[PDB]
Amino acid sequence: SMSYTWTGALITPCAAEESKLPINALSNSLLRHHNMVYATTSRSAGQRQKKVTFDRLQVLDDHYRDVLKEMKAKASTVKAKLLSVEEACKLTPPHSAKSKYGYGAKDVRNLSSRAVNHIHSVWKDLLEDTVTPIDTTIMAKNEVFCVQRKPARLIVFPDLGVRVCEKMALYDVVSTLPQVVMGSSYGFQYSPGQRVEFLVNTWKSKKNPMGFSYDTRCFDSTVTENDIRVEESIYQCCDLAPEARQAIKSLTERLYIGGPLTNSKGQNCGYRRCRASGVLTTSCGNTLTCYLKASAACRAAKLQDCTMLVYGDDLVVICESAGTQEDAASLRVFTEAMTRYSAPPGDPPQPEYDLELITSCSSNVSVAHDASGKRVYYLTRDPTTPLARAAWETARHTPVNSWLGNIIMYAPTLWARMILMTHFFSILLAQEQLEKALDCQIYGACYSIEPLDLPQIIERLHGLSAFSLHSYSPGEINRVASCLRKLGVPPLRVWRHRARSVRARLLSQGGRAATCGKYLFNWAVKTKLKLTPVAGYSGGDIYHS
Ligand SMILES: CNC(=O)c1c(-c2ccc(F)cc2)oc2cc(N(CC[C@H]3OB(O)c4ccccc43)S(C)(=O)=O)c(C3CC3)cc12
Secondary structure, three states, rough: OOOOOOOOOOOOOOOOOOEEOOOOOOOHHOOHHHHHHEEEEEHHHHHHHHHHEEOOOOOOOOOHHHHHHHHHHHHHHEEOOOOHHHHHHHHOOOOOOOOOOOOHHHHHEEEEEEEHHHHHHHHHHHHHOOOOOOEEEEOOOOEEEOOOOOOEEEEEOOOOHHHHHHHHHHHHHHHHHHHHHHHHHHHHHOOOHHHHHHHHHHHHHHHOOOEEEEEEEOOHOOHHHHHHHHHHHHOOOOOOOOOHHHHHHHHHHHHHHHHHHEEOOOOOOEEEEEOOOOOOHHHHHHHHHHHHHHHHHHHHHHEEEEEEEEEEEEEEEEOOOHHHHHHHHHHOOOOOOOOOOOEEOOOOOOEEEHHHOOEOOEEEEEEEEOOOOEEEEEEEEEEHHHHHHHHHHHHHHEEEEEEHHHHOOOOOOOHHHHHHHHHHHHHHHOOOOOOOOOOEEEEOEEEEEEEHHHHHHHHOOOOOOOOOOOOOOOOHHHHHHHHHHHOOOOOOOHHHHHHHHHHHHHHHHHHHHHHHHHOHHHOOOOOOOOOOOOOOOOOOOOOOO
């Protein structure tokens, strides 16, 4: 079956689209090589359509059915509840896309009669009708990158009223089921500090550890009708209210398995027979499906004492080594099994015998040292995309502030501390907006966060050591330095000089501002001060504050 069929109608924008990096008076202080930064637009949608459109073949063996039975047994222990209309409304992001039927996200959150009445009618229709395909909108995403250009990603989502009903039927399920079914392998349960701890402990638990990442090419398109029905069967193992069972069946048949694609202008663009990127079950569904296929593939490859870590379509396996030649051979069998299950890799997997050489979710483990000189592990990444997006956000206000999300999730890194913290606190100081809450995304979920609360947030997610890490590895430092030269960002020595100023400015204001100065920028001073004291919903339209 083809992942998509297309009519020929274009994927259209709903507003003006900027591809070129916007520039203001602050831009050059961060980044000089402006032509290297670009944003994707609907003009490349055609290119993406070609990439994501292909035939899927699936051959399912006993390993697959064995693992599925085990997952269902665990799912059978979960008890999930329906959320009320009111609870589902409160989880709706303030700036979520408005309904076609005369109400928006703020109406939903406020429990307006019009919004609530339509939600009730959508819900009743889900109970009464388990066959009629539900409409979806297809859009090209606008995302910023550094050159070497990517074509726009496509997103597919149903109407607001449907999105609220998804929460009612499935929010409790997708929040609780994955951890029970997959145990320690469910990647979204960890904070960055907890994840690093798990990865290190998993590596040390093996006598002779080997590990590899496996990244499937266009995962959403490899997801078949079978996969989505198997996914439903796992959900239905839960102890559920009868009304929830019906709604989950209806949503699966009418939305999750596939449906018609409509552009922003209301024209039929085609039909989908694979994963929709913008439904509540996207993250949970991808995690379960990846875990199922990969667990079965481990058995086919006879990999010994496997510990898997899965988040959406991202996969890492750490296991007992059988020797270099033997490990390489076993990965070939693993990939052959995954391919039979419909999930071939973008690049063939490579066995690694050092934890730090494995990259997943664009990230790798690295080592620094705390004040006492003890080794502290932390997750980092190539800073190119974070810095490209920071430059865009310096000149343009955007729906999501990636810089804030990056500071929070990569707070221990030398690039987040020296560049992102220094740059944006200077900007916030100049506009007196330190107390202004900003929208950002952590693990696909939307959060409203004031910059002044960053010290407490960082401490809780990474520990107090995030404010005193030093003696970073030569490889990490070189990667950062190389990226700065590439983008025309000033060298780290300049940022240290700037941070002393920003620190001094923050201390001068007292209160929570001074606390930001003290903890976030203690790295910048020569004589240091004494420093003292969730889940995954990518595309799921989820909000917390
Ligand atoms: C299966 N792989 C994993 O669970 C992860 C690994 C990993 C595992 C094994 C290895 F050997 C090496 C690395 O590294 C990871 C790094 C992340 N980072 C999230 C960063 C990024 O993702 B989000 O879309 C996002 C949003 C805002 C800012 C940053 C991010 S995070 C916040 O630093 O932990 C995550 C987030 C849950 C998605 C997951 C993993």
